[PDB]
Amino acid sequence: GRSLELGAADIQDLESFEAGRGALPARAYLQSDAPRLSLNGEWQFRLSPGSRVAPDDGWQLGEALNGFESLPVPSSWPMHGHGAPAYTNVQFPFAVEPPHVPEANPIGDHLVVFEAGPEFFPHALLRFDGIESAGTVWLNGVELGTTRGSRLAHEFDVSGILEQGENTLAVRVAQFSAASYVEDQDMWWLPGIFRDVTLQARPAAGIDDVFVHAGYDHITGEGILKVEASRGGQAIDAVVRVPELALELAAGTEVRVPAVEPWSAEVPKLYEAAVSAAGESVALQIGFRSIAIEDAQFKVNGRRILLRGVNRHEHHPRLGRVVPRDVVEAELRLMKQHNINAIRTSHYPPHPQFLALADQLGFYVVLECDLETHGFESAGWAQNPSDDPQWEDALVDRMRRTVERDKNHASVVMWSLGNEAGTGRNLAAMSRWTKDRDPSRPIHYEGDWSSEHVDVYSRMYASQAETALIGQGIEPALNDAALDARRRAMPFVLCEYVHAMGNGPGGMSEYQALFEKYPRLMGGFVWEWLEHGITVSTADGVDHYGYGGDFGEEVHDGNFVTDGLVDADRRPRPGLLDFKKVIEPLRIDVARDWTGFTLRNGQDFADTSAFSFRYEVEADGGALDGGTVDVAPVAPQSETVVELPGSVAALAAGLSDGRPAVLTVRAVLGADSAWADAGHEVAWGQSVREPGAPVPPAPVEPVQVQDSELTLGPVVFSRATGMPTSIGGVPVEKLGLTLWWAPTDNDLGREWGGADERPLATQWKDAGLNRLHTRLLGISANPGQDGGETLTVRTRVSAADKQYGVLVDYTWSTDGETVGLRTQVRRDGTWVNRGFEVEWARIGLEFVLGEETELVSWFGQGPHQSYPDTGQGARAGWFSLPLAKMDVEYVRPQECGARSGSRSAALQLGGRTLEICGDPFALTVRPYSQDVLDAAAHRPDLKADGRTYLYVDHALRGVGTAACGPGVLEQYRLKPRDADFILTLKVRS
Amino acid sequence: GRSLELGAADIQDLESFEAGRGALPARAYLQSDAPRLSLNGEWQFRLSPGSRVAPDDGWQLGEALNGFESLPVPSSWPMHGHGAPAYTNVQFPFAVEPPHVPEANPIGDHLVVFEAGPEFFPHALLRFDGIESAGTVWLNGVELGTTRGSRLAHEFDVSGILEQGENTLAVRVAQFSAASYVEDQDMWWLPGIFRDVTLQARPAAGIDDVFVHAGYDHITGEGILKVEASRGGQAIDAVVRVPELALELAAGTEVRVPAVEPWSAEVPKLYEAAVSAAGESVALQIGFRSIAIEDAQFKVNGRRILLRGVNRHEHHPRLGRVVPRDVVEAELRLMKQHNINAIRTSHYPPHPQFLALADQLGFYVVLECDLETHGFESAGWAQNPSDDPQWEDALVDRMRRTVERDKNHASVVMWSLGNEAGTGRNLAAMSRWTKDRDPSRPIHYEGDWSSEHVDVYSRMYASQAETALIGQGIEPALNDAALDARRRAMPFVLCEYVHAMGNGPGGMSEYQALFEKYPRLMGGFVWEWLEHGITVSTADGVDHYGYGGDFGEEVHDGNFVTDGLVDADRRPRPGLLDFKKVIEPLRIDVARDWTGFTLRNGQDFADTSAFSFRYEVEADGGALDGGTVDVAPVAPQSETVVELPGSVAALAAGLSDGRPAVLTVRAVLGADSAWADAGHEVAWGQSVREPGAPVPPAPVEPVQVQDSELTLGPVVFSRATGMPTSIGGVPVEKLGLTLWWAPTDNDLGREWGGADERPLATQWKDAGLNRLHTRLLGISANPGQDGGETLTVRTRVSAADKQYGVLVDYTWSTDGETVGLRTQVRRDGTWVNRGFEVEWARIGLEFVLGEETELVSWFGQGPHQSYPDTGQGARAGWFSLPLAKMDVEYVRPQECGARSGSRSAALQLGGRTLEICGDPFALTVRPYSQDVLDAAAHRPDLKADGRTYLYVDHALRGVGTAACGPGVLEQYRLKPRDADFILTLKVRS
Ligand code: NA
Ligand code: NA
């Protein structure tokens, strides 16, 4: 019997089910006049590969340091060259055997020397706001305690250890600990001290914790205020002063303020208040709100509200978990600018400073505890911590610390027990505690569908259909009659829906229609706000985002970090633009006769008084008229009809039959707000006078036959191919039918149900839809009129080893000036492969041109892209973009850039402009081919070859959200069918 | 109404269901004294991308050629830079719509000018032996006709077109034609004139075709001879002279020769004969044989024979379909050297010159017609030519031309209608014709399992089990009572089995046991003889074989061309070495007491008289004794017992208890034969005296504990890891358990049946078996004896996101000189993933050493590799190889190089030699890691890193033949279980 392994005692600590030891009781984050010293700055940093290899050179004392270097704190140290980021989603990065930790466990030693003034005597504390995932803290070689709960705050008492003058603070941080088993969220695994380390003095007769109770009686219009204040866990005498309400009360007593302005996301009214004791005073912002669940509805201040929300992770493309305050203010303002009123802190408490901003700019906030045991799902939740009693104290500590920190803020309207932790005893323990401490807020958890220990029914990525059932209260009952009776009486919320990976999300409209129609639906939260992209510079110094698997990770999920509405640098993806329109607070139905418009106010509290209503009339290359209309304030959930100036309606009948004109009624801010400047666009509506169907040119031109070529009008053909080689001088290198997209991220994912287990992208490859070949059948010339000949090229399209195909015929005609192309498409054989019917991505034509396009113009829906289930934010008008701005810079290159519902388009090539008219078609123009687009793993992989790839699609497919949740809806799917369309071509040289 | 496409008439020809027009009636390939002129040499060659683009510049006349260049003929023109090779297997390279051809159809114009002497007047013909796939032939601007049937010979009459003096011959060749639909074999698609173009004069009163009927009466010992000779399709008077049999008869009459020596693969007795007419005489080699199907047995000359065969494609690594005669002679001799007696010409007639060689060196030849419509299987054989009456004449022409060419040869014992053409009317038409023309030979076809139109029951890749049933005649009956009665009375043959892709094939022994035990089993043909590798030179001029998909092919099958017993350059893969032993014609069971051996003659005709029997006794580094034993000739299918010299048996009892000695009795050729030199090894047998289990060293050495390291005997450890860092001075960089191979080609293929659809390679990746991590549990030191301490390192092995694992413990001990390692392995949890139990590839240890190994020695089975279901040819002995010769150069790098059944091994590193002893283990040594081996797509991807990767496996897995056909057999599979083994380590410096 003998023992000889190194670092045993260190690991036993890492493998404890105990919460952080030594730390003071959990309290709220308060703004205090008590002297503070921030220890943020250059610290000394040493990295070790394991705990068994971690040096014991008494480094904690700060002198004779071996191998240390300066590292900024707070920070995520992989972001600074020390190691590399790693990313997994459903999977753990280590062997699952709780609570044991792997041998490859990066240990980062942190050290800093600071001097402490007399202000921090006799009593003071150290406050860590976040250490991932386990930390041991020494002050002048004395162990203070350990920290567990990476996104939770720990405070240690340094009274009697802190010396006057220079002090030495040493923190040992381990990446993986037993706590890693309960923090399995969807993100890069980035260890380190990533939040503020703070030294704060604790005066005698000071305030340790404050609990604010600000309620609103919507009937009597009275505020109900009562402020608890305590020191050392016991209630104390303190004075509460609210200047604006002109009152002065003692803590612990409950008074009713006669008239208060209630708080909401629409009107974030806050009252300045201070809680004063002898030793210190605390500064608070008080918002009067009351939350009730009544008649299966989630109500705030008496009225049902609609959550238009997103899921906000904390991420930066260069700093790790560190999100600079200016960056936080920026994104919150951006959310407000796009009609967002709710946030779910997924899947952990955010930076303490976040809560204040959510109070100030109006947001309904779902504050989620730092708990996710998603990696145990793989094995049927065997060894799940949520049900293991060994984990009870540790998990309850996580809930307590979460609730305690942010209880005072009005924005927090719900506590959430965590994400995807399964079901268990501990979850029930966590809920039970929270209902006892803070009854003012309902409780949210998605994992337990029985909804036994929560106040709202919550699901993620439920189908539009399923939601429609739940909204009507006719969803299938639970086995338990008692439990079903409770859940059927709960409001419903989608804590995650419309996955926004890559091109998408689609189907956002079908969800919103249900949100507006059924009171039981609270609305919900989009997944997610931002991409977790990380900036990388190449050998030639191109920088682009990188995703999972790009940093050498043994185990990864590729590009799933990229599912955001904005990129890592907070630049809006087209999805956010569409989202803004879907959840807009006002609906404007412009009448067809342009006499007036119908306006409905979709807000729950405010009226249409902060808005200014403008109208615009666009036609050709000029705004024909503009102005402002006077709209009497409209009550919330009410609608009126506003008549437009007679001048507008007069211009309608005034314009010629068949030329396009667009009437736009826009709701903009009357004056500056905290989150936007005046004139900012909130909601809009349109009525469009569309051009009639174009007329095919006179077939009065004959076909001139030479030895190897044909000529008709300005179009030169090839007698071998049957395809044009030149139109009005523009080099046509290729023309063919396309049935296939470059697979989006939605296509790469398996679809919800169905006998076909294969991702739609795979279905296409097996069907050979990406490798189509054309066989020429014959070229006819047929009489038109007055010597005119109409050329007809008959072809068949198919792929290798396939017996099915499609017959397409191109009949050309021209009056000598304008070229008329007609395409007929017929199915040859049954399109089934591997026992499943093959779906198409499009019915369109690919034009490859030998000259670059300098600039693209069109009339239809823009500026950004449009697909059948998307492009809601794309409005009618005239748009002109450089070729470079046509594309969309998704992290992983895929199908994007299609402008649906086009009527006409113009491509300028050198000195020539190519006009394309016809029936509604979808426009796409690229500097590179699809084979290039598909193959590309990153943006740099895309090199232009000097050609112009023009795409004109008759019918398109929906993009859906198949990456996670519902795929393409039925009405948006594209199955094999026979089709036709006419085009109008012309070249102005 | 009008038509304007180019090259319409050319394509209509390509799309005809008609056979070659203009060609003379099919006849046999005869050696004639009639004057011949070979036109092989430099020709002029022009390539065009399509038939619509193919120039009509009257190039056929040979002057004012534009864009021509010199190209050798015969040749495959992609092998000469003109285009590139393309490879598919089951799939067609173009859209399936018979008989239409793609637009991308390479057209190669061939042209040559030759002068013709007066000998070729007044009558002569042009003979093309092979044009792939369609050819049009002009002579001096006159169209002779077209050729259909790429591996079939066409002859055109040039009488009255051939001028005296200079003539100009022009051939237009198209790669794809309607005939491509019926030539869908497993190979590179290589067009061109790839066989001899020949000019032959046809004298008056000459012989056009000869049919030889040479039968053998095994009862009376009489030859039955009758030779038909004809001119212009009508019988003529000719004189047959057979010098050796001293007879002279007139053609058309049937005589019985009193005493003839019969022909067989074992005794290829041929009689010289000449058929003389006035104008010319024909030289023939006559072999007397008779084929009968009787009592469900395939009989030749009265006796049941055993087909030990292979499938021979015609391929060269540099020339395409062109296989030089010296290369053909070479491989045929190589086959004979490895006990092969049968060949299946897959899947087309071979070069005309092949048939003669198969007569001379003894081979049973299955001659297969050029027909495969395998690409229609994809769509349930819709539009299958085999059943389409439009194809009848074309398909019957293929059978006629095939039979007619090679009817005279004795080696051809069966006509085969083709491969994988499905079922149809035309197949029945082909059989019906063949039975009428040549009843002397049975008919083979695999596609129609009902076996309605054939003479033998034939299957491919049927399981060992299924074969065992068929052998006993108890296979499940057919729906048709009448048909079942016929098929149940047929002999059975596997036209393709034991797929030899990559490492393998395994399970060859279990098949052969059935072949020997059941008379109904004819034996069968291995797939296949050679790899279709193609030589490629890199930027630094490394040359290596390339496979499908490596030449830019839109559609491919990767490395499936690589499934041979030899590489493209006819270098034996280990599979051939194993195969030679499995099908050896003699079995030698050496008695245990070394007194004698049992010898059985497995041949059907010959006796043991051409052999010399040698014996050898090896022990340590010396052959102790050698000699020759006198064995009375043993009759075929009979066995005798031969006593060894008393000196041998005396040496057995003479040697110490526990030292190894190997007795080898070997059958070698007494004198030179046509295919090998005297002394060549045919069959062998062994009896082995194995060393006793090694004894664990005295645990008398204590553990010396320092700060960061441990020391026990000559082994230095690391206290952090628990792994040795040094043994006797050799740097040990790593030591760990392995459960995973680098997936072979068999592992990459789906397995036959089972709920698990996943290839075994994929099963491993999902299970995380390739990414194992170890967690240290503890290091103990326990008392041994006399101050001795036995170190024990306890660890656990697992992978990320997995809850199952394995507990392995390493207990070390040493007497100061020899190190004793013991490994205990225990399963922790159930090894199931995705609902399926996880199989292991091995139970072994990986040693990574910081020094290169110069040379590896061992005692066990060698020289080549050994796996549970393979290594039959690996014999017992002492082997020593350079590290470079340990590896096996498979085209795609995979698991290989394991020497199973090892007893001891020695690795020399610089000046140190490392000895490893113990229980039977499998040895593998590599210059690179497994991660390198797996990732490598080609041989060049393998770069040594200066380390030595040593593998010692307790238990191994079978390789099977899962790439196509049966996977690993039950007794060879490796499932999770608890195991142990002891090792003996020692370093001699
Ligand atoms: Na995600
Ligand atoms: Na093959």
mmCIF file of C-alpha atoms in Angstrom, chain A residues 1-6 15 52-53 90-97 100-103 375-376 378-379 381-383 554-555 703 705 707-708 710 719-721 757 771-783 789 791 794 796 798-804 828, chain B residues 1-6 15 52-53 90-97 100-103 375-376 378-379 381-383 554-555 703 705 707-708 710 719-721 757 771-783 789 791 794 796 798-804 828:
data_model
loop_
_atom_site.group_PDB
_atom_site.id
_atom_site.type_symbol
_atom_site.label_atom_id
_atom_site.label_comp_id
_atom_site.label_asym_id
_atom_site.label_seq_id
_atom_site.Cartn_x
_atom_site.Cartn_y
_atom_site.Cartn_z
ATOM 1 C CA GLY A 1 0.000 0.000 0.000
ATOM 2 C CA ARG A 2 1.457 3.299 -1.206
ATOM 3 C CA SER A 3 0.513 6.371 -3.282
ATOM 4 C CA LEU A 4 2.766 8.163 -5.763
ATOM 5 C CA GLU A 5 0.747 10.363 -8.151
ATOM 6 C CA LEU A 6 1.237 14.132 -8.456
ATOM 7 C CA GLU A 15 -13.905 17.078 -8.413
ATOM 8 C CA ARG A 52 -0.511 17.424 -11.880
ATOM 9 C CA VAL A 53 2.086 19.537 -13.679
ATOM 10 C CA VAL A 90 -24.394 18.901 -27.689
ATOM 11 C CA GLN A 91 -21.178 17.091 -26.905
ATOM 12 C CA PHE A 92 -18.779 17.454 -24.000
ATOM 13 C CA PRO A 93 -15.084 18.002 -24.793
ATOM 14 C CA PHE A 94 -14.030 15.310 -22.311
ATOM 15 C CA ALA A 95 -14.975 11.817 -21.163
ATOM 16 C CA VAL A 96 -18.251 11.884 -19.248
ATOM 17 C CA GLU A 97 -17.632 10.485 -15.777
ATOM 18 C CA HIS A 100 -13.756 13.428 -12.691
ATOM 19 C CA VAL A 101 -11.792 15.833 -14.879
ATOM 20 C CA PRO A 102 -9.415 15.137 -17.780
ATOM 21 C CA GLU A 103 -5.628 15.189 -17.505
ATOM 22 C CA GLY A 375 -24.350 16.399 -22.670
ATOM 23 C CA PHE A 376 -26.070 13.682 -20.650
ATOM 24 C CA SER A 378 -26.703 11.267 -25.269
ATOM 25 C CA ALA A 379 -27.032 8.444 -22.744
ATOM 26 C CA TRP A 381 -29.828 11.315 -18.997
ATOM 27 C CA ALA A 382 -27.945 8.669 -17.040
ATOM 28 C CA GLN A 383 -25.809 10.270 -14.309
ATOM 29 C CA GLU A 554 -10.376 17.123 -31.682
ATOM 30 C CA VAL A 555 -14.157 17.443 -31.458
ATOM 31 C CA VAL A 703 -32.329 33.680 -89.203
ATOM 32 C CA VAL A 705 -27.263 30.901 -91.528
ATOM 33 C CA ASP A 707 -21.180 27.688 -91.654
ATOM 34 C CA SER A 708 -20.641 27.391 -87.899
ATOM 35 C CA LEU A 710 -26.474 31.430 -86.615
ATOM 36 C CA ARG A 719 -24.898 25.665 -84.442
ATOM 37 C CA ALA A 720 -23.165 22.946 -82.440
ATOM 38 C CA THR A 721 -24.606 23.944 -79.061
ATOM 39 C CA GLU A 757 -33.344 10.444 -43.204
ATOM 40 C CA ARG A 771 -24.056 17.692 -62.073
ATOM 41 C CA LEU A 772 -26.531 18.255 -64.889
ATOM 42 C CA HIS A 773 -25.769 17.581 -68.542
ATOM 43 C CA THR A 774 -27.639 18.766 -71.614
ATOM 44 C CA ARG A 775 -28.232 16.889 -74.848
ATOM 45 C CA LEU A 776 -29.206 18.866 -77.941
ATOM 46 C CA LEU A 777 -32.230 17.470 -79.771
ATOM 47 C CA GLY A 778 -32.663 19.830 -82.714
ATOM 48 C CA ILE A 779 -32.718 23.423 -83.924
ATOM 49 C CA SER A 780 -35.752 24.576 -85.887
ATOM 50 C CA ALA A 781 -36.508 27.784 -87.739
ATOM 51 C CA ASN A 782 -40.188 28.620 -88.069
ATOM 52 C CA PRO A 783 -42.037 31.399 -89.920
ATOM 53 C CA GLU A 789 -38.128 33.559 -88.401
ATOM 54 C CA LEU A 791 -35.638 29.964 -83.834
ATOM 55 C CA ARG A 794 -34.964 21.734 -78.244
ATOM 56 C CA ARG A 796 -33.035 17.564 -72.730
ATOM 57 C CA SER A 798 -30.364 15.026 -67.019
ATOM 58 C CA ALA A 799 -27.456 13.591 -65.045
ATOM 59 C CA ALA A 800 -25.171 10.569 -65.225
ATOM 60 C CA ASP A 801 -26.671 7.187 -64.279
ATOM 61 C CA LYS A 802 -30.152 8.729 -64.157
ATOM 62 C CA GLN A 803 -33.095 7.825 -66.384
ATOM 63 C CA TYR A 804 -35.279 10.807 -65.490
ATOM 64 C CA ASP A 828 -39.442 13.409 -68.866
ATOM 65 C CA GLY B 1 -40.312 23.407 -90.583
ATOM 66 C CA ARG B 2 -36.518 23.464 -90.846
ATOM 67 C CA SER B 3 -33.421 21.769 -89.373
ATOM 68 C CA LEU B 4 -30.169 23.497 -88.433
ATOM 69 C CA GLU B 5 -28.076 21.345 -86.065
ATOM 70 C CA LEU B 6 -24.552 20.142 -86.884
ATOM 71 C CA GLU B 15 -27.257 5.786 -81.933
ATOM 72 C CA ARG B 52 -21.035 17.982 -83.954
ATOM 73 C CA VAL B 53 -17.645 19.696 -83.831
ATOM 74 C CA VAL B 90 -22.053 0.583 -61.178
ATOM 75 C CA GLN B 91 -22.795 3.976 -62.654
ATOM 76 C CA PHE B 92 -22.749 5.176 -66.244
ATOM 77 C CA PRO B 93 -20.705 8.297 -67.056
ATOM 78 C CA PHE B 94 -23.589 9.818 -69.026
ATOM 79 C CA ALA B 95 -27.351 10.302 -68.857
ATOM 80 C CA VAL B 96 -29.144 6.994 -69.353
ATOM 81 C CA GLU B 97 -31.440 7.321 -72.355
ATOM 82 C CA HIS B 100 -28.734 8.587 -77.283
ATOM 83 C CA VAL B 101 -25.165 9.719 -76.643
ATOM 84 C CA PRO B 102 -23.852 12.774 -74.775
ATOM 85 C CA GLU B 103 -22.605 15.941 -76.459
ATOM 86 C CA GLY B 375 -26.077 0.541 -65.083
ATOM 87 C CA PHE B 376 -29.768 -0.201 -65.589
ATOM 88 C CA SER B 378 -30.324 1.454 -60.637
ATOM 89 C CA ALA B 379 -33.815 1.834 -62.093
ATOM 90 C CA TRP B 381 -33.721 -2.765 -65.084
ATOM 91 C CA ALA B 382 -36.084 -0.425 -66.907
ATOM 92 C CA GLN B 383 -34.997 0.033 -70.539
ATOM 93 C CA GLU B 554 -17.244 14.399 -62.453
ATOM 94 C CA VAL B 555 -18.357 10.950 -61.307
ATOM 95 C CA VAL B 703 11.068 1.909 -6.712
ATOM 96 C CA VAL B 705 11.301 8.075 -5.869
ATOM 97 C CA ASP B 707 10.684 14.783 -7.273
ATOM 98 C CA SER B 708 9.202 14.477 -10.764
ATOM 99 C CA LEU B 710 10.179 7.334 -10.690
ATOM 100 C CA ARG B 719 4.947 10.761 -11.840
ATOM 101 C CA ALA B 720 2.455 12.994 -13.629
ATOM 102 C CA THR B 721 1.544 10.492 -16.349
ATOM 103 C CA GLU B 757 -26.573 0.429 -41.893
ATOM 104 C CA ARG B 771 -10.036 9.692 -30.251
ATOM 105 C CA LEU B 772 -9.346 7.988 -26.935
ATOM 106 C CA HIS B 773 -8.288 9.826 -23.791
ATOM 107 C CA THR B 774 -6.757 8.424 -20.625
ATOM 108 C CA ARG B 775 -7.358 9.537 -17.057
ATOM 109 C CA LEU B 776 -4.831 8.554 -14.399
ATOM 110 C CA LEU B 777 -6.385 7.023 -11.288
ATOM 111 C CA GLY B 778 -3.398 6.296 -9.060
ATOM 112 C CA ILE B 779 0.128 4.922 -8.820
ATOM 113 C CA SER B 780 0.812 2.266 -6.200
ATOM 114 C CA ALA B 781 4.007 0.618 -5.030
ATOM 115 C CA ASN B 782 3.580 -2.844 -3.551
ATOM 116 C CA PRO B 783 6.029 -5.240 -1.868
ATOM 117 C CA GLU B 789 8.662 -3.216 -5.218
ATOM 118 C CA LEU B 791 4.711 -0.556 -9.376
ATOM 119 C CA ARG B 794 -4.237 2.385 -12.651
ATOM 120 C CA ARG B 796 -9.232 4.594 -17.306
ATOM 121 C CA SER B 798 -12.643 6.659 -22.811
ATOM 122 C CA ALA B 799 -13.617 9.331 -25.326
ATOM 123 C CA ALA B 800 -15.358 12.699 -25.297
ATOM 124 C CA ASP B 801 -19.140 12.705 -24.766
ATOM 125 C CA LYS B 802 -19.061 8.987 -23.936
ATOM 126 C CA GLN B 803 -20.015 7.399 -20.619
ATOM 127 C CA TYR B 804 -18.541 3.964 -21.314
ATOM 128 C CA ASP B 828 -16.469 0.025 -17.353
#
